[PDB]
């Protein structure tokens, strides 16, 4: 295979600024002066979309802040000025010689101002209790940067087992992230205790954001 190695594998770049992504091939993808190299953008949940062909040519309907350059084994994609909608994974790909391999991929994060999460906590529904189970849910919404810590407490005691977490991809409009944390328990155990707490710690403050409820209220 012609192997295509991208660098960096991830980066974060401010709005308005220049992002550059590199693709290095294990052997030349050129023939007769043409570089048989595509660049693709892949947004969250979508198929990939062709941005640049023949290394430097802009595909119809792609904005002109995207450009490519390079030849033989060394290629670059630049996005300048970077926009929020450019949050995505980018791949180079060659069609000089089969197999027509894709690069390892580069995840581009849009850097924005820090933002603390909006935290909300939800007791089990009666429907779920009526059916025998109990899940407590905590949303941590619209925060930046993506790294965040959630701790659950039952009657003041920290509970780590039965917690599952899921993060969204970066928002295309506001460049924030969100996370959901679910504490699953038997109904028996849920009804055995009273106070349930979700505590979020994010670099925006040294104090956790604490949301709570009492079952008997």
């Amino acid at each position: 295979n012609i192997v295509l190695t991208q660098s960096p594998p991830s980066l974060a770049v401010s709005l308005g600024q220049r992002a550059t992504i590199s693709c290095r091939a294990s052997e030349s993808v050129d023939s007769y002066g043409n570089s048989f190299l595509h660049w693709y953008q892949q947004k969250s949940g979508q198929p990939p979309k062709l941005l640049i062909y023949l290394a430097s040519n802009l595909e119809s309907g792609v904005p002109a802040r995207f450009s490519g350059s390079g030849s033989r084994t060394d290629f670059t994609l630049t996005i300048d000025p970077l926009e929020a909608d450019d949050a995505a994974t980018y791949y180079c790909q060659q069609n000089n010689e089969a197999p027509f391999t894709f690069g390892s991929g580069t995840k581009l994060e849009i850097k924005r101002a820090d933002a603390a999460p909006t935290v909300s906590i939800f007791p089990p529904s009666s429907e779920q209790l009526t059916s025998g189970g109990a899940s407590v849910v905590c949303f941590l919404n619209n925060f930046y940067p993506k790294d965040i810590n959630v701790k659950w407490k039952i009657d003041g005691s920290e509970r780590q087992n039965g917690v599952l977490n899921s993060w969204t991809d970066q928002d295309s409009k506001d460049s924030t992230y969100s996370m959901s944390s679910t504490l699953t328990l038997t109904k028996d155990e849920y009804e055995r205790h009273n106070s349930y707490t979700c505590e979020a710690t994010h670099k925006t403050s040294t104090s956790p954001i604490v949301k709570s409820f009492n079952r008997n209220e």
Binding site: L50, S120, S135
Partner: protein, 210 residues
């Protein structure tokens, strides 16, 4: 112009599956049809391509043993046959026309390699315990992926976050939040709509103050 692809597949480890791809707006005979794999959270991988005009196909060596691309120009349809499935074959498979200056991409066909049984979600409303208000729904215990979630049948799309599902004991769980002005609810109704195509179900759950 599109490449139409066959529907989601759930298949047992060790079995085989055959996926299909049919252009709308052009003939496969006039071009080349490529297949491209993407495992959950991983990169794109070129499987192979076929020229339907002469029957020649070419593969990445990683896939050549278990993957076979064929074409039938009388039905304008290209096919990808995968044998001896394992969990590493669980992925989205894209049908594509990849040429030097232009591409057409299919939407992708999902293949889940698992013995687990198809099961519809339970959908539970999430209302506050007690300016803007956040509501949710918990979509619990379904298999296989995917589900799709909307709010008020698509009319509420701002302020919505639908979280990636998590897999546990052969069942998936996800949640979705929506944030609305505090004067909107509960005066006006807020409902999450959850479709699970594998079980041919949809559920509309109204969020009701507790």
């Amino acid at each position: 112009v599109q490449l139409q692809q066959s529907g989601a597949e759930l298949v047992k480890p060790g079995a085989s599956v055959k996926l299909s791809c049919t252009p709308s707006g052009f003939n496969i005979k006039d071009t080349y049809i490529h297949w491209v794999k993407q495992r959950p959270e991983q990169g794109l991988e070129w499987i192979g391509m076929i020229n339907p005009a002469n029957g020649n196909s070419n593969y990445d060596p990683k896939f050549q043993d278990k993957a076979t691309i064929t074409a039938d120009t009388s039905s304008n349809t290209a096919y990808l046959q995968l044998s001896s499935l394992t969990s590493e074959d669980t992925a989205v498979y894209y049908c594509a026309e990849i040429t030097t200056d232009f591409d057409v991409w299919g939407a992708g066909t999902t293949v889940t390699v698992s013995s687990a049984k198809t099961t519809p979600p339970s959908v539970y409303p999430l209302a506050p315990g007690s300016s803007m208000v956040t509501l949710g729904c918990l979509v619990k215990g379904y298999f296989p992926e995917p589900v799709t979630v909307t709010w008020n049948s698509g009319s509420l799309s701002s302020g919505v976050h639908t979280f990636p599902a998590v897999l546990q004991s052969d069942l998936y769980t996800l949640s979705s939040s929506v944030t609305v002005p505090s004067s909107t609810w509960p005066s006006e109704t807020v409902t999450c709509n959850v479709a699970h195509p594998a079980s041919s179900t949809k559920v509309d759950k109204k969020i009701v103050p507790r």
